[PDB]
Amino acid sequence: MKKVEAIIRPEKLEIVKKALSDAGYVGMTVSEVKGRGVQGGIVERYRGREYIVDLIPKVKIELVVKEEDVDNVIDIICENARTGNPGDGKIFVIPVERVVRVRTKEEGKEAL
Amino acid sequence: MKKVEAIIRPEKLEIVKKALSDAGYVGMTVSEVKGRGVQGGIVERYRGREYIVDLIPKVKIELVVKEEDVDNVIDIICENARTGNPGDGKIFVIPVERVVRVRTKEEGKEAL
Amino acid sequence: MKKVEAIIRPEKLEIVKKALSDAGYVGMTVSEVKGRGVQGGIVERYRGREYIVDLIPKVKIELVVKEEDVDNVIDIICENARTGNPGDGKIFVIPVERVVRVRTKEEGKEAL
Ligand SMILES: Nc1ncnc2c1ncn2[C@@H]1O[C@H](COP(=O)(O)OP(=O)(O)OP(=O)(O)O)[C@@H](O)[C@H]1O
Ligand SMILES: Nc1ncnc2c1ncn2[C@@H]1O[C@H](COP(=O)(O)OP(=O)(O)OP(=O)(O)O)[C@@H](O)[C@H]1O
Ligand SMILES: Nc1ncnc2c1ncn2[C@@H]1O[C@H](COP(=O)(O)OP(=O)(O)OP(=O)(O)O)[C@@H](O)[C@H]1O
Ligand SMILES: O=C(O)CCC(=O)C(=O)O
Ligand SMILES: O=C(O)CCC(=O)C(=O)O
Ligand SMILES: O=C(O)CCC(=O)C(=O)O
Ligand SMILES: [Mg+2]
Ligand SMILES: [Mg+2]
Ligand SMILES: [Mg+2]
């Protein structure tokens, strides 16, 4: 099992989660975050002066899935989250050693 | 060292954190999140029409602990977070390779 | 690749992120959290009575970096986040097995 952690534009949550759900990837945790990447933020202008805004709102989605499904999850996220402009997102894959469903104490792949 | 990441009902935070603390599991980070599991959300009715609400508020708790304590932490969370209805929670165990206390630069088990 | 996850005082975000950026560590995700450590919270007094506040606001910063840079990232965070009083922060290092830039589908170290 692996956690796919993707930080994406807030306005892309709806299309990404629909595309994931349609492909069978339903279990997901969503968090509001702020961040920056390589570019260090965005340049804005106020009264003729340019300045850097160095933290931008994003949404973090976390999906724990079987390892064999990671490629497809990443492909779906990238296809649907992309706009072509810097800031479209970053994905990390993090190992998950155990998964437990609280209600039933099921573990493993059936507990996803 | 392992991170126990549990996503549970918001109204179960108090009883879960009390039970963990009573058993000696104190260090914890709490985050407000939204999510869905297998069921894909909840069915609601508005003016006779049923629709799906596909993200539900939850609370994420993260406890970094010694590996030997993971079983007990999971047992405590499940016992106290359960209600018997879908949505009671999901737990992931994620490896933690290093722990550092900022104030003192202590590392390892004593830094938990 | 490794995720450095640091939970620090909210009022230290600015100096920590500036120091990290100055040293070349730019990519970062920031989350608002609450937590407690060893001390279990803070003692407060209201109308002569002392009570425990057991969750304190903090900021979580997450930086995914090359393994060889983890030591330096931790050193920078600790130097700039410390005040000398309990609550200055906790850092966890979590393995990251894959990194993908959404816009370009780049992976690996160049996608950081
Ligand atoms: N190395 C990293 N560590 C932590 N979070 C990161 C990192 N890289 C990016 N992020 C998070 O991902 C979000 C989106 O990053 P972003 O798309 O800007 O990446 P990028 O590498 O700059 O690529 P692009 O050139 O397409 O902008 C950031 O706002 C931040 O929350
Ligand atoms: N595979 C998963 N990946 C990411 N987060 C998940 C996943 N499964 C569940 N979650 C998170 O855990 C929360 C609680 O899940 P939930 O209890 O509904 O799990 P479930 O597998 O549907 O079990 P149940 O049948 O008891 O509802 C979700 O709202 C979501 O935040
Ligand atoms: N073992 C842990 N698991 C989860 N989160 C933790 C843990 N230890 C600390 N944290 C998080 O880090 C924050 C800061 O912790 P803190 O600085 O109080 O650590 P500490 O071990 O008590 O050290 P100090 O004695 O310097 O206070 C907490 O409020 C919490 O969010
Ligand atoms: O996040 C944005 O929308 C643009 C800024 C960006 O790509 C960054 O800081 O890396
Ligand atoms: O989270 C709820 O309370 C019920 C909905 C649920 O279990 C889910 O989407 O998996
Ligand atoms: O977080 C604080 O500022 C002090 C309380 C503390 O260190 C703790 O609960 O461990
Ligand atoms: Mg960018
Ligand atoms: Mg469910
Ligand atoms: Mg403390």
Residue numbers in the entry:
A (entry chain A), B (entry chain A), C (entry chain A): 1 to 112
Question: What did the article's authors report about this structure?
Answer:
PII-family proteins are key players in the regulation of nitrogen metabolism in bacteria, archaea and in the plastids of plant/algae. All PII proteins known so far show a typical homotrimeric organization. The monomeric unit, of circa 11–18 kDa, consists of two α-helices, four β-strands (organized in a double ferredoxin-like fold β1α1β2β3α2β4) and three protruding loops called B, C and T. In the trimeric state, clefts are formed at the dimeric interface through the interaction of the B-loop and the base of the T-loop of one subunit with the C-loop of the adjacent one. These clefts constitute the binding site for ADP/ATP, magnesium (Mg) and 2OG.
